Scaffold this active site. Sequence first.
Site, PDB file in Angstrom:
ATOM      1  N   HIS A 191       0.827  -1.205   0.000  1.00  0.00           N
ATOM      2  CA  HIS A 191       0.000   0.000   0.000  1.00  0.00           C
ATOM      3  C   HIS A 191       0.870   1.268   0.000  1.00  0.00           C
ATOM      4  CE1 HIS A 191      -2.102   3.114   2.530  1.00  0.00           C
ATOM      5  NE2 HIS A 191      -3.052   2.894   1.640  1.00  0.00           N
ATOM      6  N   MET A 198      -8.753  10.543  -6.392  1.00  0.00           N
ATOM      7  CA  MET A 198     -10.079   9.979  -6.141  1.00  0.00           C
ATOM      8  C   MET A 198     -10.247   8.465  -6.320  1.00  0.00           C
ATOM      9  SD  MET A 198     -12.151  10.564  -9.780  1.00  0.00           S
ATOM     10  CE  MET A 198     -12.608   8.659  -9.668  1.00  0.00           C
ATOM     11  N   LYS A 214     -20.655   4.069 -16.545  1.00  0.00           N
ATOM     12  CA  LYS A 214     -19.445   4.812 -16.844  1.00  0.00           C
ATOM     13  C   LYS A 214     -18.367   4.711 -15.751  1.00  0.00           C
ATOM     14  CE  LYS A 214     -21.783   7.882 -20.042  1.00  0.00           C
ATOM     15  NZ  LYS A 214     -21.767   9.165 -20.786  1.00  0.00           N
ATOM     16  N   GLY A 261      -8.609  19.398  -5.939  1.00  0.00           N
ATOM     17  CA  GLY A 261      -7.445  19.776  -5.153  1.00  0.00           C
ATOM     18  C   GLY A 261      -7.668  20.922  -4.162  1.00  0.00           C
TER      19      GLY A 261
HETATM   20  N1  NAD Z   1     -15.944  13.495 -31.017  1.00  0.00           N
HETATM   21  C1  NAD Z   1     -16.850  14.141 -30.109  1.00  0.00           C
HETATM   22  O1  NAD Z   1     -16.957  15.358 -30.153  1.00  0.00           O
HETATM   23  C2  NAD Z   1     -17.632  13.369 -29.084  1.00  0.00           C
HETATM   24  C3  NAD Z   1     -18.033  14.004 -27.900  1.00  0.00           C
HETATM   25  C4  NAD Z   1     -18.763  13.292 -26.945  1.00  0.00           C
HETATM   26  C5  NAD Z   1     -19.073  11.953 -27.191  1.00  0.00           C
HETATM   27  N2  NAD Z   1     -18.683  11.361 -28.331  1.00  0.00           N
HETATM   28  C6  NAD Z   1     -19.055   9.867 -28.538  1.00  0.00           C
HETATM   29  O2  NAD Z   1     -20.479   9.483 -28.329  1.00  0.00           O
HETATM   30  C7  NAD Z   1     -20.539   8.113 -28.125  1.00  0.00           C
HETATM   31  C8  NAD Z   1     -21.626   7.721 -27.134  1.00  0.00           C
HETATM   32  O3  NAD Z   1     -21.352   8.062 -25.809  1.00  0.00           O
HETATM   33  P1  NAD Z   1     -22.234   7.721 -24.554  1.00  0.00           P
HETATM   34  O4  NAD Z   1     -21.587   8.433 -23.375  1.00  0.00           O
HETATM   35  O5  NAD Z   1     -23.626   8.275 -24.729  1.00  0.00           O
HETATM   36  O6  NAD Z   1     -22.256   6.155 -24.350  1.00  0.00           O
HETATM   37  P2  NAD Z   1     -23.169   5.309 -23.358  1.00  0.00           P
HETATM   38  O7  NAD Z   1     -24.204   5.368 -24.526  1.00  0.00           O
HETATM   39  O8  NAD Z   1     -23.117   6.518 -22.378  1.00  0.00           O
HETATM   40  O9  NAD Z   1     -21.936   4.321 -23.479  1.00  0.00           O
HETATM   41  C9  NAD Z   1     -20.782   4.472 -22.714  1.00  0.00           C
HETATM   42  C10 NAD Z   1     -20.060   3.209 -22.313  1.00  0.00           C
HETATM   43  O10 NAD Z   1     -20.654   2.614 -21.180  1.00  0.00           O
HETATM   44  C11 NAD Z   1     -20.795   1.260 -21.404  1.00  0.00           C
HETATM   45  N3  NAD Z   1     -21.968   0.737 -20.737  1.00  0.00           N
HETATM   46  C12 NAD Z   1     -23.204   1.254 -20.799  1.00  0.00           C
HETATM   47  N4  NAD Z   1     -24.021   0.493 -20.064  1.00  0.00           N
HETATM   48  C13 NAD Z   1     -23.310  -0.513 -19.552  1.00  0.00           C
HETATM   49  C14 NAD Z   1     -23.616  -1.605 -18.728  1.00  0.00           C
HETATM   50  N5  NAD Z   1     -24.964  -1.792 -18.277  1.00  0.00           N
HETATM   51  N6  NAD Z   1     -22.648  -2.460 -18.374  1.00  0.00           N
HETATM   52  C15 NAD Z   1     -21.386  -2.274 -18.816  1.00  0.00           C
HETATM   53  N7  NAD Z   1     -21.034  -1.245 -19.612  1.00  0.00           N
HETATM   54  C16 NAD Z   1     -21.981  -0.366 -19.980  1.00  0.00           C
HETATM   55  C17 NAD Z   1     -20.903   1.107 -22.888  1.00  0.00           C
HETATM   56  O11 NAD Z   1     -20.459  -0.136 -23.280  1.00  0.00           O
HETATM   57  C18 NAD Z   1     -20.068   2.182 -23.401  1.00  0.00           C
HETATM   58  O12 NAD Z   1     -18.786   1.745 -23.684  1.00  0.00           O
HETATM   59  C19 NAD Z   1     -19.169   7.692 -27.643  1.00  0.00           C
HETATM   60  O13 NAD Z   1     -18.764   6.596 -28.348  1.00  0.00           O
HETATM   61  C20 NAD Z   1     -18.252   8.851 -27.792  1.00  0.00           C
HETATM   62  O14 NAD Z   1     -17.093   8.555 -28.472  1.00  0.00           O
HETATM   63  C21 NAD Z   1     -17.983  12.025 -29.269  1.00  0.00           C
HETATM   64  N1  NAD Z   2      -3.160   3.418  -2.287  1.00  0.00           N
HETATM   65  C1  NAD Z   2      -4.450   2.812  -2.127  1.00  0.00           C
HETATM   66  O1  NAD Z   2      -4.514   1.594  -1.968  1.00  0.00           O
HETATM   67  C2  NAD Z   2      -5.708   3.631  -2.233  1.00  0.00           C
HETATM   68  C3  NAD Z   2      -6.893   3.036  -2.683  1.00  0.00           C
HETATM   69  C4  NAD Z   2      -8.071   3.781  -2.794  1.00  0.00           C
HETATM   70  C5  NAD Z   2      -8.050   5.129  -2.450  1.00  0.00           C
HETATM   71  N2  NAD Z   2      -6.909   5.683  -2.024  1.00  0.00           N
HETATM   72  C6  NAD Z   2      -6.967   7.186  -1.677  1.00  0.00           C
HETATM   73  O2  NAD Z   2      -8.036   7.546  -0.726  1.00  0.00           O
HETATM   74  C7  NAD Z   2      -8.245   8.903  -0.843  1.00  0.00           C
HETATM   75  C8  NAD Z   2      -9.728   9.204  -0.777  1.00  0.00           C
HETATM   76  O3  NAD Z   2     -10.355   9.575  -1.967  1.00  0.00           O
HETATM   77  P1  NAD Z   2     -11.882   9.942  -2.001  1.00  0.00           P
HETATM   78  O4  NAD Z   2     -12.448   9.474  -3.327  1.00  0.00           O
HETATM   79  O5  NAD Z   2     -12.571   9.219  -0.864  1.00  0.00           O
HETATM   80  O6  NAD Z   2     -12.001  11.504  -1.813  1.00  0.00           O
HETATM   81  P2  NAD Z   2     -13.199  12.445  -2.246  1.00  0.00           P
HETATM   82  O7  NAD Z   2     -13.090  12.961  -0.773  1.00  0.00           O
HETATM   83  O8  NAD Z   2     -14.001  11.135  -2.518  1.00  0.00           O
HETATM   84  O9  NAD Z   2     -12.125  12.976  -3.278  1.00  0.00           O
HETATM   85  C9  NAD Z   2     -12.343  13.016  -4.651  1.00  0.00           C
HETATM   86  C10 NAD Z   2     -11.960  14.310  -5.320  1.00  0.00           C
HETATM   87  O10 NAD Z   2     -13.090  15.110  -5.584  1.00  0.00           O
HETATM   88  C11 NAD Z   2     -12.760  16.418  -5.289  1.00  0.00           C
HETATM   89  N3  NAD Z   2     -13.912  17.187  -4.886  1.00  0.00           N
HETATM   90  C12 NAD Z   2     -14.719  16.923  -3.847  1.00  0.00           C
HETATM   91  N4  NAD Z   2     -15.693  17.847  -3.841  1.00  0.00           N
HETATM   92  C13 NAD Z   2     -15.502  18.687  -4.868  1.00  0.00           C
HETATM   93  C14 NAD Z   2     -16.164  19.823  -5.365  1.00  0.00           C
HETATM   94  N5  NAD Z   2     -17.315  20.349  -4.692  1.00  0.00           N
HETATM   95  N6  NAD Z   2     -15.702  20.436  -6.461  1.00  0.00           N
HETATM   96  C15 NAD Z   2     -14.608  19.968  -7.083  1.00  0.00           C
HETATM   97  N7  NAD Z   2     -13.937  18.889  -6.652  1.00  0.00           N
HETATM   98  C16 NAD Z   2     -14.367  18.248  -5.560  1.00  0.00           C
HETATM   99  C17 NAD Z   2     -11.747  16.354  -4.189  1.00  0.00           C
HETATM  100  O11 NAD Z   2     -10.957  17.487  -4.194  1.00  0.00           O
HETATM  101  C18 NAD Z   2     -11.028  15.106  -4.462  1.00  0.00           C
HETATM  102  O12 NAD Z   2      -9.804  15.279  -5.089  1.00  0.00           O
HETATM  103  C19 NAD Z   2      -7.602   9.373  -2.131  1.00  0.00           C
HETATM  104  O13 NAD Z   2      -6.566  10.235  -1.882  1.00  0.00           O
HETATM  105  C20 NAD Z   2      -7.088   8.172  -2.799  1.00  0.00           C
HETATM  106  O14 NAD Z   2      -5.879   8.441  -3.402  1.00  0.00           O
HETATM  107  C21 NAD Z   2      -5.757   4.993  -1.904  1.00  0.00           C
END
Ligand code: NAD
Ligand code: NAD
Lengths: 344, 344
Positions: B116, B174, B225, B304
Site C-alpha cells: 500500500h 479519487m 461509466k 485539489g
Molecule cells: N468526437 C466528439 O466530439 C464526441 C463528444 C462526446 C461523445 N462522443 C461519442 O459518443 C458516443 C456515445 O457516448 P455515450 O456516453 O452516450 O455512451 P453510453 O451510450 O453513455 O456508453 C458508454 C459506455 O458505457 C458502457 N456501458 C453502458 N451500459 C453498460 C452496462 N450496463 N454495463 C457495462 N457497460 C456499460 C458502454 O459499453 C459504453 O462503452 C461515444 O462513443 C463517444 O465517443 C464524441
Molecule cells: N493506495 C491505495 O490503496 C488507495 C486506494 C483507494 C483510495 N486511495 C486514496 O483515498 C483517498 C480518498 O479519496 P476519495 O475518493 O474518498 O475523496 P473524495 O473525498 O471522494 O475525493 C475526490 C476528489 O473530488 C474532489 N472534490 C470533492 N468535492 C468537490 C467539489 N465540490 N468540487 C470539485 N472537486 C471536488 C476532491 O478534491 C477530491 O480530489 C484518495 O486520496 C485516494 O488516493 C488509496
Amino acid sequence: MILKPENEKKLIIDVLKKFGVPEEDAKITADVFVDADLKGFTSHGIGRFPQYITALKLGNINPKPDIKIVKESPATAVIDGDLGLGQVVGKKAMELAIKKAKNVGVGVVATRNANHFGIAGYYSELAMNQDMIGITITNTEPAMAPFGGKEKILGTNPIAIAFKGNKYKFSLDMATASIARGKILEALRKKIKIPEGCAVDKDGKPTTDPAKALEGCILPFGGPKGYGLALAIEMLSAIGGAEVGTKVKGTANPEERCTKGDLFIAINPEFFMGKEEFKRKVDELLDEIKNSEPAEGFEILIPGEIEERNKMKRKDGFEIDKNLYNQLKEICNELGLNIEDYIE
Amino acid sequence: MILKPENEKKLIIDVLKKFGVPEEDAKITADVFVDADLKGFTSHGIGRFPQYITALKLGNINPKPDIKIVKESPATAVIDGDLGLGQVVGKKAMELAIKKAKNVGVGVVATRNANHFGIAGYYSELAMNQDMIGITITNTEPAMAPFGGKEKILGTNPIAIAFKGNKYKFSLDMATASIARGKILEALRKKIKIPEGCAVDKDGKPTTDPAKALEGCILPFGGPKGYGLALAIEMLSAIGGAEVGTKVKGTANPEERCTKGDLFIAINPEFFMGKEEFKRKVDELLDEIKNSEPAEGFEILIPGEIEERNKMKRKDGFEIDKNLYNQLKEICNELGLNIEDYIE
Ligand SMILES: NC(=O)c1ccc[n+]([C@@H]2O[C@H](COP(=O)([O-])OP(=O)(O)OC[C@H]3O[C@@H](n4cnc5c(N)ncnc54)[C@H](O)[C@@H]3O)[C@@H](O)[C@H]2O)c1
Ligand SMILES: NC(=O)c1ccc[n+]([C@@H]2O[C@H](COP(=O)([O-])OP(=O)(O)OC[C@H]3O[C@@H](n4cnc5c(N)ncnc54)[C@H](O)[C@@H]3O)[C@@H](O)[C@H]2O)c1
C-alpha cells in the site's frame, strides 16, 4: 428506411471524392461513420454527414490537407491537421502512436487543427487490434457546467479505452457528459422527461424538463468525481496546442473553424509483463467479472458488449429517418449522383 | 489529542528506523503519511500506521528491499518492490517515470510486489511540481461489485491526475468507489441514510440504509461509466505483472502478502505545445472555471482545492482519537521510545 453499411461506405466515398478528398482519405472517413452507425452511436454516424457537407463548402473542412508532424520524439508527436477530416488526422495520429509504442513501449500523439473525428472508440480499437492498450480523448464546444456552476464551459469530453485478451474484449467508449444533447432534443419531440440528474436549467437548479435543459447545462456524470475527470480531459486533449474552455468552437457547428484537440495514447504490453501474459490476465479478470453474482434484474456486461451486440444486429442494415434520406437525396443531386445507388 | 505534522514525522521515522528501515526511506514514508493527514485523507494517514507495524513484524513488509528495475526502455519500466514500503517503491517509480518524460516526453512505470502506497495524489504531484502532468492509478482488495452485480471484485481503484499553470493548480485524487465503508458505518452510528446508487442489498437490491449497506456490496461511482473506468484501472494498474480481481491481497490486511499493482505516468508538456504555453492555457482554463457563475448554495472548486484548504487549516496539528493514541503508545513502549516525545 434500411441503409446497408457497404452502401453507406460507397455513398460517403463518392460524395467526398466530389469535393477533392483523395480516395484513401475518403475510405478512411467512411469506415468511422459506418462503425458509429453499426454500434448505435447514430449521432456520430451518417446523420452527421450533411453537417460535413455544409462545412466543406464553407471551407471549414480542407479536402486536401497538409498534415504535418510539427514535433516528434521516440515516444511523442504533435500533429497539425490543417483543417482536414478528423478521421484522417485521427487515424494518422493513432497509427503513429501505435508505431511509437511498438518501438519504446508507449506512444502519445496530440493533434491540433482538425475536425470532429466521430466516435473515440474507433481509434483506441486500432490499438487494441495491434495487441495494445488504446486511450483516446478530445474536447468539445462548451456543453457542461463546473460542478456547482450554471455556465457552459466544459465540453462533453469523451474518453475511450480499449484492450483485449484471447477471448474477451474491453472497449470503454464514453462521453463524460451524463446525457447527449441529441437525447434531450429527442425527448423534446416526444414530449417527455429526461433522466433525473442529467441537466440543470437556466438557473443552477436541477431539471427533468427537456426545454429548460436545452438553454441550461448538461451535468458531468459522476458528481464531483466525474466533473474532475472532464476537467482533466478538457486540458489533456489540448496539449498539442488546441483551445480549451469557451474558445473551443466548431465541433458541431459547420460555420466555425474547428479549434478542439485530441490526444491518442498507445501503451504496449510487451514492454511490461508481456503480451501473452497480459492477454491471459485480461481474460482471467473479465471472465471473473462476467461470472460474478448478478444483482436482481441485471446481467453483468463488460464495457463494449452492448456496442458489439448492436453491430451484430445491424450488420445487414439499419434504419434512418426520412428527413435525413431527404438531405442525402439533395446532396447527391447537387454532385450529380443518384441516391438510389445506395438506398434501395 | 492533537498530533502536530512535525511530531508525526518524527514518530514514524523513529518507529520505522527501529525496524531496520533506512532513515532516508523512513523520511519518504513519513512524508506521505503526513500528506495524507494534512489533506484530511485520514484513512491513509497515521491512522494506518499500526497495521504497518503488524505487517513489518509478520514480514509482509521488507524493511530492506532490493528494489529492481526488471525491464526498461526509453519510455517504460517495470519495477519489482521486493515487498518494500509502497511509499519507497512509489517514489522511485514516479521519479523514474519523470526522468524518462524529461528525455522523450513521456514516462510510464509499472510496479509489482510492493505494499500500500498511501494517497495517490502524492505521487501525481511529484510530476506536477516538475512542471509535468502526473497520472497515478492502482489496485486494491475486492471492495465493490461490478455494475449489475452484487459481489466484491474490483478494488477501490483510485486515480490521481495533477498538473498546474502559473497561478492555478489541478490535483484530482479519487477512489472509483461511490462511497467508503468508513462513511457508511459513520452513517450507521450517526443514523442517517447514505446516498443513492452507492450500494446494494444482501440480495442485490438498491438500498440507502447503512445497515443493509454493511451487509451488501458497495458500487462504483458513476453508474456504468464509473464502473467502466474502475474496470480499466483494475487492469491497467497491474500491467507490471501484479494480480487482479480477487487475487489482489494484502492492501488492508497485514497478514496477507500484498499483490496489488501501480501504474505511474508522467507527461511532459515541453514535448508538446511547450512548458510556458501549457501553463498559460492551464491558467486560462482554470481561471474561466473558477470564475464562472455558481449555482445557488454552491461554490465552484477545482479538484485539489479542498485538500489545499485542509492542509492550511491543519498545519498546527490535527485531532486523533484515544484509540490510536493507545495503539501508538504501546508501539512506542515495545520499542523503548516514549509517546510523550511526540504527543506532548
Ligand atoms: N468526437 C466528439 O466530439 C464526441 C463528444 C462526446 C461523445 N462522443 C461519442 O459518443 C458516443 C456515445 O457516448 P455515450 O456516453 O452516450 O455512451 P453510453 O451510450 O453513455 O456508453 C458508454 C459506455 O458505457 C458502457 N456501458 C453502458 N451500459 C453498460 C452496462 N450496463 N454495463 C457495462 N457497460 C456499460 C458502454 O459499453 C459504453 O462503452 C461515444 O462513443 C463517444 O465517443 C464524441
Ligand atoms: N493506495 C491505495 O490503496 C488507495 C486506494 C483507494 C483510495 N486511495 C486514496 O483515498 C483517498 C480518498 O479519496 P476519495 O475518493 O474518498 O475523496 P473524495 O473525498 O471522494 O475525493 C475526490 C476528489 O473530488 C474532489 N472534490 C470533492 N468535492 C468537490 C467539489 N465540490 N468540487 C470539485 N472537486 C471536488 C476532491 O478534491 C477530491 O480530489 C484518495 O486520496 C485516494 O488516493 C488509496
